[PDB]
Coordinates of C-alpha atoms in Angstrom, one line a residue:
Chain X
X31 CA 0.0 0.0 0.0
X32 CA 0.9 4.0 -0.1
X33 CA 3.0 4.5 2.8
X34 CA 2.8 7.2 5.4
X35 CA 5.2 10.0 5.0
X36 CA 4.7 12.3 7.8
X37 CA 4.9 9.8 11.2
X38 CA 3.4 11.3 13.8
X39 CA 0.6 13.8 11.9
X40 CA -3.0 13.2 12.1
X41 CA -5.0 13.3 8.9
X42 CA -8.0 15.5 8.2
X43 CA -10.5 15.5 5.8
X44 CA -12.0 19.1 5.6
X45 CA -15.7 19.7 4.2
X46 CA -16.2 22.7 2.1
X47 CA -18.7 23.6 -0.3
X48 CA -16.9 22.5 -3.3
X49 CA -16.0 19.0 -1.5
X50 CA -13.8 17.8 0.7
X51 CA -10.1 18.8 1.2
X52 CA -7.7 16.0 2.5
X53 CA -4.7 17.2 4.5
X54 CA -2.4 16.0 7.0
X55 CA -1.5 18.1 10.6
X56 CA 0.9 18.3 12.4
X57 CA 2.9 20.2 14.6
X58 CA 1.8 23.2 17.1
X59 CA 2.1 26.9 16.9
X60 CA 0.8 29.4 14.3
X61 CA -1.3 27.8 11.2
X62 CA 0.7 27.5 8.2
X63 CA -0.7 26.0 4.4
X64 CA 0.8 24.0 2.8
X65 CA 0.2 23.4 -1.1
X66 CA 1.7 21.2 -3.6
X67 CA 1.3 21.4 -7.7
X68 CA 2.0 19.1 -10.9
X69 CA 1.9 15.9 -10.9
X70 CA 2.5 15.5 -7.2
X71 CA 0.2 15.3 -4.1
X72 CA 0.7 16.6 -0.3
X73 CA 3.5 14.3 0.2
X74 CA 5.8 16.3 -1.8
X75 CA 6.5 18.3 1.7
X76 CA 7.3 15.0 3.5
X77 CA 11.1 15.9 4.1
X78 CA 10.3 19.8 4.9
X79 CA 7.4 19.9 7.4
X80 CA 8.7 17.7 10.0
X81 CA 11.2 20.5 10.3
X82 CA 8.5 22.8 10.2
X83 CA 6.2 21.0 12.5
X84 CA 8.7 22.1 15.3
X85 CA 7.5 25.6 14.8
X86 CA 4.2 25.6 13.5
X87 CA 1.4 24.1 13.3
X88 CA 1.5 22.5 10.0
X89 CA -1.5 21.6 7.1
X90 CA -0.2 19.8 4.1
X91 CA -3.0 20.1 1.7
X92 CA -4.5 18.1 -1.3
X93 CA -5.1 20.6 -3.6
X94 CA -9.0 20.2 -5.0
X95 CA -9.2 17.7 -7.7
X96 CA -5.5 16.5 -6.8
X97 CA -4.4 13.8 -4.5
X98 CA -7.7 12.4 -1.7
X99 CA -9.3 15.7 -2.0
X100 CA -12.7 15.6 -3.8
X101 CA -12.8 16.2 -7.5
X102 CA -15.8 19.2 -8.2
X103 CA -17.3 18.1 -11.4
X104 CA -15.9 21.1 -14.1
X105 CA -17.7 23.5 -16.6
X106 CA -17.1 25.3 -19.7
X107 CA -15.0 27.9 -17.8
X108 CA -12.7 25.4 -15.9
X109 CA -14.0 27.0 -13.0
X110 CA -13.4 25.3 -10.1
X111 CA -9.9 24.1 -10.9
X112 CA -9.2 28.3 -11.5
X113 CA -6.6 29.4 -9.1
X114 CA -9.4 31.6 -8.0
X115 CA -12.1 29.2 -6.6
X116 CA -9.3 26.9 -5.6
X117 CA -8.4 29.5 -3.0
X118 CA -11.8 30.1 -2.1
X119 CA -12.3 26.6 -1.3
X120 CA -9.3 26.4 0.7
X121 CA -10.3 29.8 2.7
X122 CA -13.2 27.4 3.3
X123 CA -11.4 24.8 4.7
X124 CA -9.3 26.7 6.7
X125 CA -12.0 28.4 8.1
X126 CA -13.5 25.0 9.1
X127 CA -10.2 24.4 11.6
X128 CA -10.5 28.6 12.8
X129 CA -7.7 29.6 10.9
X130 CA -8.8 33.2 9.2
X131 CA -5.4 34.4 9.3
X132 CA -2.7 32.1 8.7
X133 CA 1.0 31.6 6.9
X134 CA 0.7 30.0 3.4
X135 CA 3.3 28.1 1.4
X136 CA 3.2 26.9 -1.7
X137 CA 4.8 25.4 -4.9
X138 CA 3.9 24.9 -8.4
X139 CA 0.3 25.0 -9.1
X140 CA -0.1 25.5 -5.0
X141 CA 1.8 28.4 -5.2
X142 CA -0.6 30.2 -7.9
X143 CA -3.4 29.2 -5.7
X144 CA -1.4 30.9 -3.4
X145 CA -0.9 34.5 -4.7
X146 CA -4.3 34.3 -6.3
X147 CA -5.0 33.8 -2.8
X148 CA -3.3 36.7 -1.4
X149 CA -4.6 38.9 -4.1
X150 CA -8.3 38.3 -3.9
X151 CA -8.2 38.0 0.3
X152 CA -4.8 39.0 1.3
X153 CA -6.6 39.9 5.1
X154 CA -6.1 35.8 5.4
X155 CA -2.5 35.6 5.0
X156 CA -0.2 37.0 7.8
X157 CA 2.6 35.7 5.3
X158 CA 3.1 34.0 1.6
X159 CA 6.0 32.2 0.4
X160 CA 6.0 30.7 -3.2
X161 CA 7.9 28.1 -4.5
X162 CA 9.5 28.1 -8.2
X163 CA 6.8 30.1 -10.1
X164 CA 6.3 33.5 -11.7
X165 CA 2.8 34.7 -11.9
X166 CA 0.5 32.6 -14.7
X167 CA 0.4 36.0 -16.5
X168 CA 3.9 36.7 -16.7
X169 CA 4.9 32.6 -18.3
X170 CA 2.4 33.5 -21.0
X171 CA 3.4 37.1 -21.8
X172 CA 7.3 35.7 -22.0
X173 CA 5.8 32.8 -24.2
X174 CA 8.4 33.0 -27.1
X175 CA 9.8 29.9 -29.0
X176 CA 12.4 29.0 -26.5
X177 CA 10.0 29.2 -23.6
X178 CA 7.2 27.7 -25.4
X179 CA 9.7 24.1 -26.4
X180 CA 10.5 24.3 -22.5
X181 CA 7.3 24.3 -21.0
X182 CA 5.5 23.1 -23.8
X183 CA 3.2 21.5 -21.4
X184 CA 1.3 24.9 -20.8
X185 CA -0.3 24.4 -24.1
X186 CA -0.7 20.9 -24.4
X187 CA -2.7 19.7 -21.6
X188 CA -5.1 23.0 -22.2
X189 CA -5.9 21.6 -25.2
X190 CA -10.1 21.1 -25.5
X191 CA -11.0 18.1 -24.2
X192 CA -10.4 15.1 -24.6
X193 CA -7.2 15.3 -26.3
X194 CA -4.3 15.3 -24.0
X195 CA -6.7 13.0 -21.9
X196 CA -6.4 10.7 -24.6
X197 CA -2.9 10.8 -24.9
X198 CA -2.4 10.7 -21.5
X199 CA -4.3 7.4 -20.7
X200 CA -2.3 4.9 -23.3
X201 CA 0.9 5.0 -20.6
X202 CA -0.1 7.1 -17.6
X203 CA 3.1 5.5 -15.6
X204 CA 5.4 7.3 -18.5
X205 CA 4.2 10.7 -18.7
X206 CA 4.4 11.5 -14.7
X207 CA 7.9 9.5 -14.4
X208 CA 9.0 12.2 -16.8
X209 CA 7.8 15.1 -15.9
X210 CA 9.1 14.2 -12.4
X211 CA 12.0 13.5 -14.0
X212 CA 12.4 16.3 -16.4
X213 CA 12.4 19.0 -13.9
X214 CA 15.2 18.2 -11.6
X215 CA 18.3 19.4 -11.6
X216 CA 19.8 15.9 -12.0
X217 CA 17.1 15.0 -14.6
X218 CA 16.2 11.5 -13.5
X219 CA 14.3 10.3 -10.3
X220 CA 16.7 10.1 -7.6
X221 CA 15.7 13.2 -5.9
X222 CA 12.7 11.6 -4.8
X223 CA 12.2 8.9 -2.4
X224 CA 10.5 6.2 -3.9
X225 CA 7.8 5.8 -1.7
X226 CA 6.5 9.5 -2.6
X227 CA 6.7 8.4 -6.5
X228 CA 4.5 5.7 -5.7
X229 CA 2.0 8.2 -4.3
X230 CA 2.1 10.2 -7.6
X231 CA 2.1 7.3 -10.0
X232 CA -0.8 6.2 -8.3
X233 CA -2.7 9.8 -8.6
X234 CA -2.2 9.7 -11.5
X235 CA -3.0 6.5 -12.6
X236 CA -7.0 7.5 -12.1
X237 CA -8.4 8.8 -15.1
X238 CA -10.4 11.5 -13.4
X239 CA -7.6 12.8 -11.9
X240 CA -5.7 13.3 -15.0
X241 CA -8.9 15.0 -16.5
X242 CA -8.9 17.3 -13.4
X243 CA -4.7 18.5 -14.1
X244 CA -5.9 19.1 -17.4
X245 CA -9.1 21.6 -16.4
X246 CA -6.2 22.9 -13.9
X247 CA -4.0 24.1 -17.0
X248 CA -6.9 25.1 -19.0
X249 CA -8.4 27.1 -16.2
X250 CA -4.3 28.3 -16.5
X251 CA -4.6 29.0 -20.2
X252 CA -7.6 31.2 -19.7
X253 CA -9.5 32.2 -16.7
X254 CA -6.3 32.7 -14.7
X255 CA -4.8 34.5 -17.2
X256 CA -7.6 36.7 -17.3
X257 CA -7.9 37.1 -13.5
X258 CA -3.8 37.9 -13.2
X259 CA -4.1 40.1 -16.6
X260 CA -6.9 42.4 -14.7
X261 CA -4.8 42.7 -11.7
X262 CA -1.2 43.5 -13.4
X263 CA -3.0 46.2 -15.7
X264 CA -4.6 47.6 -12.7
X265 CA -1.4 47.9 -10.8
X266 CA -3.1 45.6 -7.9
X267 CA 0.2 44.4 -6.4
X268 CA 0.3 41.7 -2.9
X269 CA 0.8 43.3 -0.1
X270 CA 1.0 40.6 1.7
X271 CA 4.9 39.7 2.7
X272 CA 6.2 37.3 0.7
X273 CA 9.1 35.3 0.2
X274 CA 10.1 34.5 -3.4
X275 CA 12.2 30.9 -3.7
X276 CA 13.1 29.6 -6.8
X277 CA 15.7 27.0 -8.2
X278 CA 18.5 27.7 -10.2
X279 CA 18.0 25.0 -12.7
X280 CA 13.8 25.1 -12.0
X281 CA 11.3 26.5 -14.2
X282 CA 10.7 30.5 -13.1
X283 CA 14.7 31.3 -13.8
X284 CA 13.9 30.1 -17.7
X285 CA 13.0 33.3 -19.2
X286 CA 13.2 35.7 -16.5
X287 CA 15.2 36.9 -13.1
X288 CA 12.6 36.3 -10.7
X289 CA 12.8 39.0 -8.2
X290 CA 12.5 41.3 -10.7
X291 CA 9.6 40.4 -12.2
X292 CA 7.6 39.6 -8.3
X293 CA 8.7 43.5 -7.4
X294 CA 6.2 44.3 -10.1
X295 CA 3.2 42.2 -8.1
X296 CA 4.3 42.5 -4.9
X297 CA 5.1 45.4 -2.2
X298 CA 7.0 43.2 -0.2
X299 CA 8.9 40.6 -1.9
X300 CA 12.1 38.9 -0.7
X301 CA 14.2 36.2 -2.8
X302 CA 16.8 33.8 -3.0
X303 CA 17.7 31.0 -5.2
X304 CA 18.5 27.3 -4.4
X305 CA 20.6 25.0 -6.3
X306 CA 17.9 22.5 -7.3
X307 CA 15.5 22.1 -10.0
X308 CA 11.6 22.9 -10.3
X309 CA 11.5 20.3 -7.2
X310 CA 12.4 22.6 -4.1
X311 CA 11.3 20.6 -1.0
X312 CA 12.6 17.2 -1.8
X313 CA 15.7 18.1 -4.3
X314 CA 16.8 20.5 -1.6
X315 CA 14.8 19.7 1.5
X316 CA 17.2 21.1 4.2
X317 CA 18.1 24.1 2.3
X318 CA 14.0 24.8 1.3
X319 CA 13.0 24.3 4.9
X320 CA 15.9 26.6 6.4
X321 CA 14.6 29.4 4.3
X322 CA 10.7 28.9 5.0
X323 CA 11.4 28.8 9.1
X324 CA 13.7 32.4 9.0
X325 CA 11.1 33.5 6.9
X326 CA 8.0 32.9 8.5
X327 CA 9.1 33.2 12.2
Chain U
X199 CA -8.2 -1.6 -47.7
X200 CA -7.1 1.7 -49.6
X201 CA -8.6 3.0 -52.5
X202 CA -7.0 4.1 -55.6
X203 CA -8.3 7.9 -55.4
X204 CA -6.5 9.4 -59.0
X205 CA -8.2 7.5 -61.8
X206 CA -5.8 6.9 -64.9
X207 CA -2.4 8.1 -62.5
X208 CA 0.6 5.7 -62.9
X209 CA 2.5 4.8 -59.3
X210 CA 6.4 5.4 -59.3
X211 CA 8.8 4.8 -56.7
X212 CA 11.8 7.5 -57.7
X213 CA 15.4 6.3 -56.1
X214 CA 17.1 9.0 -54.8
X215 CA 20.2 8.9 -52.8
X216 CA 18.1 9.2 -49.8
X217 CA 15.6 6.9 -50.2
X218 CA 12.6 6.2 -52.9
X219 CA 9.9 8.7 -53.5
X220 CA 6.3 7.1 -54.3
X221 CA 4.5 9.3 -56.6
X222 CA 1.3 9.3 -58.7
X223 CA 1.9 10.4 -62.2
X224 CA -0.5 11.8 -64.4
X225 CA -1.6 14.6 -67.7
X226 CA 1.0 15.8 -69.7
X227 CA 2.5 19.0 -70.5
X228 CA 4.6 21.4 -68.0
X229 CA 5.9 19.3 -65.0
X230 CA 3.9 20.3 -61.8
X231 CA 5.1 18.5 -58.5
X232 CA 2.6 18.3 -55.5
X233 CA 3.5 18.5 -51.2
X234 CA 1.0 17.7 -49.3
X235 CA 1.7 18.0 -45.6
X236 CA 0.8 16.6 -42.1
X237 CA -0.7 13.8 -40.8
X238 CA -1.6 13.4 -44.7
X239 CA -0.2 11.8 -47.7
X240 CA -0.5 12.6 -51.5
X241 CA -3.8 11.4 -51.6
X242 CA -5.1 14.8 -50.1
X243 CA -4.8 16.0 -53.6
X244 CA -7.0 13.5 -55.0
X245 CA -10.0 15.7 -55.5
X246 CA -7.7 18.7 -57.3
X247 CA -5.2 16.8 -59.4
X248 CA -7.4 15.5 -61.8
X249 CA -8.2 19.2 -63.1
X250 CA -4.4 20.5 -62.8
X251 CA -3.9 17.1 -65.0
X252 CA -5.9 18.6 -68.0
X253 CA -2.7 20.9 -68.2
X254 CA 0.0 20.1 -66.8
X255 CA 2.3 16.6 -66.0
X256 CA 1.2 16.6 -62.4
X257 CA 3.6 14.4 -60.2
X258 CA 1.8 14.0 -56.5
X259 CA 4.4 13.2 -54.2
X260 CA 4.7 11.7 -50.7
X261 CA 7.5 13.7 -48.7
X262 CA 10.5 11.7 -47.1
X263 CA 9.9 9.9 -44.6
X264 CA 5.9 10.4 -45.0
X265 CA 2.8 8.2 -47.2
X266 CA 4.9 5.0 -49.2
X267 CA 8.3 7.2 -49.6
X268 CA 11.3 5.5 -47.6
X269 CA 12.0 7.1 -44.0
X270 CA 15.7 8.0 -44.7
X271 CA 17.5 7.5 -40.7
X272 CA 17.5 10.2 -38.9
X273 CA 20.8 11.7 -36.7
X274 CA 20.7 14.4 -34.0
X275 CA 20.2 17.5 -36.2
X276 CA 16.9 15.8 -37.8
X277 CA 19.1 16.1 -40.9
X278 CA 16.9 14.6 -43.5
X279 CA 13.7 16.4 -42.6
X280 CA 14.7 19.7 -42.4
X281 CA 13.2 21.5 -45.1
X282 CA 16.1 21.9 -46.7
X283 CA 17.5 18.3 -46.8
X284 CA 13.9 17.0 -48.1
X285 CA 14.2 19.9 -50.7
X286 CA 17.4 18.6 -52.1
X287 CA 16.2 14.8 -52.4
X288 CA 12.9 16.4 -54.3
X289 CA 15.3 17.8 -56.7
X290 CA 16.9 14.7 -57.2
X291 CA 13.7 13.0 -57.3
X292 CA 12.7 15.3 -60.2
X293 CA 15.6 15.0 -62.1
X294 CA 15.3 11.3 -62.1
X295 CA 12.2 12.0 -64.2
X296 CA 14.0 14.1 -66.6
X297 CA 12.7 17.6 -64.7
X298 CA 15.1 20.2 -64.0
X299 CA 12.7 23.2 -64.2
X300 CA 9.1 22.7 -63.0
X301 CA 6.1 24.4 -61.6
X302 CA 5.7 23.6 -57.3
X303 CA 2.9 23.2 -55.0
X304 CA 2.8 22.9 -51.3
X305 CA 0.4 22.5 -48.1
X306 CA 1.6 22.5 -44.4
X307 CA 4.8 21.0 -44.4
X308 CA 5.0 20.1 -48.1
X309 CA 4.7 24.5 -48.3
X310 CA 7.2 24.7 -45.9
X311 CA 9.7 22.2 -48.8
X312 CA 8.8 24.4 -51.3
X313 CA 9.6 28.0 -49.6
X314 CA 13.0 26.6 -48.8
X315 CA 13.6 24.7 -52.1
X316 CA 12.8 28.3 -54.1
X317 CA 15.1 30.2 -51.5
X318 CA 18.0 27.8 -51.4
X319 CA 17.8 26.8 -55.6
X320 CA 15.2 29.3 -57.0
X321 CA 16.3 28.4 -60.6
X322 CA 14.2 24.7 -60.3
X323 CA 10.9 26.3 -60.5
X324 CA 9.1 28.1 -62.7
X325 CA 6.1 29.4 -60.0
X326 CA 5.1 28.4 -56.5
X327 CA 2.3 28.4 -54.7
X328 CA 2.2 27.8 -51.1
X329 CA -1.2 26.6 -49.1
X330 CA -2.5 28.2 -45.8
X331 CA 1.3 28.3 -44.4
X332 CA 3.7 31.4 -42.9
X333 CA 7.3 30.8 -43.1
X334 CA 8.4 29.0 -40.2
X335 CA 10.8 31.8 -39.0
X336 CA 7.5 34.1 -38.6
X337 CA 5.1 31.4 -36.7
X338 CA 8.1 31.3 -34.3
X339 CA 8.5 35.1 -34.3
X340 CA 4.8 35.6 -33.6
X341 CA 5.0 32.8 -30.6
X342 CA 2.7 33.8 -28.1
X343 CA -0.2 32.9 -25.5
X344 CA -2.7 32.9 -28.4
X345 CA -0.5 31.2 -31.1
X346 CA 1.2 28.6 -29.0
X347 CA -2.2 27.6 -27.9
X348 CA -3.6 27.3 -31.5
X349 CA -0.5 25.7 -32.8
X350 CA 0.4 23.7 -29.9
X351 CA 1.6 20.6 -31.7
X352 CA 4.3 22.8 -33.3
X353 CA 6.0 21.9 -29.2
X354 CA 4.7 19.1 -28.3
X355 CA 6.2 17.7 -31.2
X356 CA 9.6 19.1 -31.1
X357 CA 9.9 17.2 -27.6
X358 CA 12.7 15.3 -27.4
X359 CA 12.2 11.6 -27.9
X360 CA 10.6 9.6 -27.3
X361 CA 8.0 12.3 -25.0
X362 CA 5.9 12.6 -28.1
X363 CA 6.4 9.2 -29.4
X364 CA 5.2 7.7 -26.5
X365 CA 2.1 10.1 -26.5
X366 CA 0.8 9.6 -29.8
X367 CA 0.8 5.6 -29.5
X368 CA -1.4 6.6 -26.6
X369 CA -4.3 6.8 -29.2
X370 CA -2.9 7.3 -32.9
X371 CA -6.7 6.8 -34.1
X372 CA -7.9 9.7 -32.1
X373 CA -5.4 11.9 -33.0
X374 CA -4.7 11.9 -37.1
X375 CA -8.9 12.3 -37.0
X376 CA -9.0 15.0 -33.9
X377 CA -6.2 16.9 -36.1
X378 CA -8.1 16.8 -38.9
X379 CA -11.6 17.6 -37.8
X380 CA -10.1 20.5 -35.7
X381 CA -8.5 22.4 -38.4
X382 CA -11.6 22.5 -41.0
X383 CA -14.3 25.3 -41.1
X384 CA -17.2 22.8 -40.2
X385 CA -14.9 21.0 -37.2
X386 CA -15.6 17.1 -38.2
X387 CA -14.5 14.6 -40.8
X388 CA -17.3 15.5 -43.3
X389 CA -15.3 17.6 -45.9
X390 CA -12.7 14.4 -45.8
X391 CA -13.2 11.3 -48.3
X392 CA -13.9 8.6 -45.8
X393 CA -11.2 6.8 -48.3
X394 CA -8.6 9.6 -48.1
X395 CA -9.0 9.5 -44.5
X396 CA -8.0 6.2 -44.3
X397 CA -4.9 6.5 -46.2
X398 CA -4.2 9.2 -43.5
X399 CA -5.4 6.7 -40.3
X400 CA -3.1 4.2 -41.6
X401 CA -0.2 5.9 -42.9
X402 CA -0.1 7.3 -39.3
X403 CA -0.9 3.8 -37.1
X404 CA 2.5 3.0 -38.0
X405 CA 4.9 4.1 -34.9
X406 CA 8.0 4.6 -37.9
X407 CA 5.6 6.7 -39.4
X408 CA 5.3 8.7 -36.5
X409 CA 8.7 9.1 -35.5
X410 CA 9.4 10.6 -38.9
X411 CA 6.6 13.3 -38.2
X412 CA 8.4 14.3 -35.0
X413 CA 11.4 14.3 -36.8
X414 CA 10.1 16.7 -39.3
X415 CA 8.8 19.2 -36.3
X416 CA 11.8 19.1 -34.4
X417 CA 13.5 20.2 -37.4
X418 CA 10.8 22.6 -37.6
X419 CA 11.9 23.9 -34.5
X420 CA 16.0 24.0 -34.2
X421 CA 17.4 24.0 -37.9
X422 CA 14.6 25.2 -40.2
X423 CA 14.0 27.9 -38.0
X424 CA 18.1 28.6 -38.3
X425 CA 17.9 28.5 -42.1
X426 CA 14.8 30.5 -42.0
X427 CA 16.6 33.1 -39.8
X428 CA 19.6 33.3 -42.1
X429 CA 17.4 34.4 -45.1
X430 CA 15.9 37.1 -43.0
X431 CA 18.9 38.6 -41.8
X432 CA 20.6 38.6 -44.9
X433 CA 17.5 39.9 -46.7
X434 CA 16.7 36.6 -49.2
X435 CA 13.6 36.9 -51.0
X436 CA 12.1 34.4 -53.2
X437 CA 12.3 35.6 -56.9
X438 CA 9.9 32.8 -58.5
X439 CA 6.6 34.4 -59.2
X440 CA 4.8 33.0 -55.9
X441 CA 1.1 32.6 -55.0
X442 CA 0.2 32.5 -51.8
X443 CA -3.7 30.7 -51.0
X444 CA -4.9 30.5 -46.9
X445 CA -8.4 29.8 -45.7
X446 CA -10.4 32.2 -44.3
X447 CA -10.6 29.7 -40.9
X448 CA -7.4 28.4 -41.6
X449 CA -3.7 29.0 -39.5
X450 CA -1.9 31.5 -41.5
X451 CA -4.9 34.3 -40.7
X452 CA -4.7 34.0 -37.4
X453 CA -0.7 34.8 -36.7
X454 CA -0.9 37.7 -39.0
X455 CA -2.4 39.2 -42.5
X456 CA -0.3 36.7 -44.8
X457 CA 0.1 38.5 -47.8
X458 CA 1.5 41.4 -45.8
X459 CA 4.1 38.4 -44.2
X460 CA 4.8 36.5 -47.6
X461 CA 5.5 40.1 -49.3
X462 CA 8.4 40.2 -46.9
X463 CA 10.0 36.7 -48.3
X464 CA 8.9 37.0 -51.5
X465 CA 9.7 40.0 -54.2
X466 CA 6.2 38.9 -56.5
X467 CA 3.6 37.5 -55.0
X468 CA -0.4 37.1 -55.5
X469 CA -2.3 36.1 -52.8
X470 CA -6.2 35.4 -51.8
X471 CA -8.3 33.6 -49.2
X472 CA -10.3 30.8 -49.8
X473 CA -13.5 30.0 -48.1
X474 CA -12.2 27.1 -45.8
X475 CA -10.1 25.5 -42.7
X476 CA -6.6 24.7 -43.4
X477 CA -7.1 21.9 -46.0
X478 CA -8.0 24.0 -48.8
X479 CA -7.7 21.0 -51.5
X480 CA -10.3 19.2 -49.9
X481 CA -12.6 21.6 -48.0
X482 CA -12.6 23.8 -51.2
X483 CA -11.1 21.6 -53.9
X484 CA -13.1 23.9 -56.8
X485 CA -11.7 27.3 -55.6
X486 CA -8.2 25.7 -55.0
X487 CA -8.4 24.1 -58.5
X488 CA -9.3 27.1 -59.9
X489 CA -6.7 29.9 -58.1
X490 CA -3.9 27.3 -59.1
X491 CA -4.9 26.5 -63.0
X492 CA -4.8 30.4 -63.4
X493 CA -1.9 30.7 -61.5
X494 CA 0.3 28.4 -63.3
X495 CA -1.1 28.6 -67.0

């Protein structure tokens, strides 16, 4: 069976009106969220929130649609896999355990939830780290033929319907195995402990989840964009303080300098790189977990 | 099985130091050679060749690698299918025939053969015409959200192998037919000759077959884009007396207005839209008949 990756946290599953959220907490102290993305589930934190479970008290979310949480059935607009309603639903959820004001970190997909988040309610967030992102807006704005071959993946699973699902479903095991793979700094698997690929492979291995990444990177392709487009041309920036973390081999350092770019979104934005790839917590779990407990305490 | 679509053509297999060339012969008078392009094979001209035959020699050709022609071996540049490689074993091809100095026709990635083949030796043809296609160097140029959403394959295929590969034997049925139906005006398989279409379904159920199709878009992406960009730089136009046919619905119109583009390559060009998606000799095979007959006569 899937093995347990966080000894000594409870598990939690959180009802909300969009459906359940699965998490595991742990820990004491102030709330702090935490929120994986693509194609991993909450155990990607496994190596980083025992460290932060010393400090905090710690959620490790599903995401909706991803992992145990509860799949909302999508529409024409994508919309609850947006980054938008995804946030909602976690406000929901978080409310649900009385945190209204709480520490959020996030990577990936996670992470847009996250500064969607902040954006829409930033009165929830005392503090906001993300993890290895730009904002949605600013990867399609710098969408150019090198950037499009490298994350060519922004266009392919927001493809209508049912075609990358079709795709997907000859080999599932192949496509997540190299995704995971692709994104490291190493470029294999060895980053990961095994155990935590298993919990992936087998997310990803139901067909319904792999419909639900794809309505998460079409919501990505449009509503998002939309949502983070109204905001950048309004001047709406976070102003919630936030911590900017990104690998020097990852994904947000192809085509841009990070800070730079999150000084134009947010008012207060700090940064620093780690030598890793796209896969922060477990390719450079001590070093990723140093920075989130200065930052947040 | 598959259906002989060109009444009264003869069959040829041309040697070339590449590989063989199958081609349907047919007419007489000036030579006029025929590119279709992807996921097709010649037989997508089967419904326009018969009236260029009443003038012309018309010689329908499969590309290399593509339909019945051999599938020379590939190396780490995508040597033989860059455009200008499959360019050079056309002109061979041709001169095996006795046809030095002959009238060209392209669609999709047969277009992109002939653009190259009247930049690199313009003094083969007498006239061009190019079907619903923009110089690769300007699809790349005009990359963005909305482009590398609409031409999203143009990536995903230019993944390294075997990422794409591995995809398409997912469901190789699905996709020839989704890429199809999703380029036309009326978004099904209804302008299609259910026989044509299944020279195209089985041309592309074979996994070599494929491969060579990736081949030819990874090209697309590294060294036709270099050759492209060479041309540009340097100021090359095409002198052959060029015509230049898109569909109203079809991909050129959407990157940009593509006379306006083509005048840019090209120091004579004509230029119209026809009423249709991006298979103009099949969704409109009278007005495509017509605009080339005129053209070259």
């Amino acid at each position: 069976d899937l093995a347990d990756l966080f000894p000594g946290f409870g598990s939690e599953w959180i009802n909300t009106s969009s459906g359940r959220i699965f998490a595991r907490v742990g820990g004491d102290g102030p709330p702090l969220l935490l929120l994986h993305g693509f194609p991993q589930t909450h155990v990607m934190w496994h190596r980083v929130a025992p460290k932060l479970a010393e400090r905090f008290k710690v959620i490790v979310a599903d995401l909706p649609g991803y992992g145990w949480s509860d799949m909302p059935e999508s529409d024409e607009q994508h919309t609850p896999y947006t980054k938008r309603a995804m946030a909602k639903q976690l406000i929901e959820a978080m409310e649900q355990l009385g945190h209204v004001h709480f520490a959020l970190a996030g990577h990936d997909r996670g992470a847009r939830v996250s500064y969607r988040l902040a954006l829409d309610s930033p009165g929830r967030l005392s503090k906001l780290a993300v993890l290895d992102i730009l904002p949605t807006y600013e990867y399609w704005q710098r969408m150019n033929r090198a950037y499009a071959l490298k994350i060519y993946h922004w266009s392919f699973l927001a493809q209508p319907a049912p075609l990358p699902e079709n795709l997907l479903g000859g080999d599932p095991d192949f496509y997540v195995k190299a995704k995971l793979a692709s994104w490291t700094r190493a470029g294999d698997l060895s980053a990961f402990d095994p155990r935590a690929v298993e919990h992936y492979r087998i997310a990803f291995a139901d067909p319904m989840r792999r419909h639900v990444m794809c309505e998460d990177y079409r919501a990505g392709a449009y509503a998002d964009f939309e949502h983070d487009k109204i905001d950048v041309e309004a001047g709406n920036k976070i102003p919630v303080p936030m911590l900017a973390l990104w690998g020097a081999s990852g994904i947000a350092q192809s085509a841009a300098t990070p800070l730079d770019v999150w000084r134009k979104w947010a008012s207060d934005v700090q940064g620093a790189p780690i030598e890793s790839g796209h896969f922060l917590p477990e390719e450079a779990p001590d070093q990723t977990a140093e920075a989130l407990v200065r930052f947040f305490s």
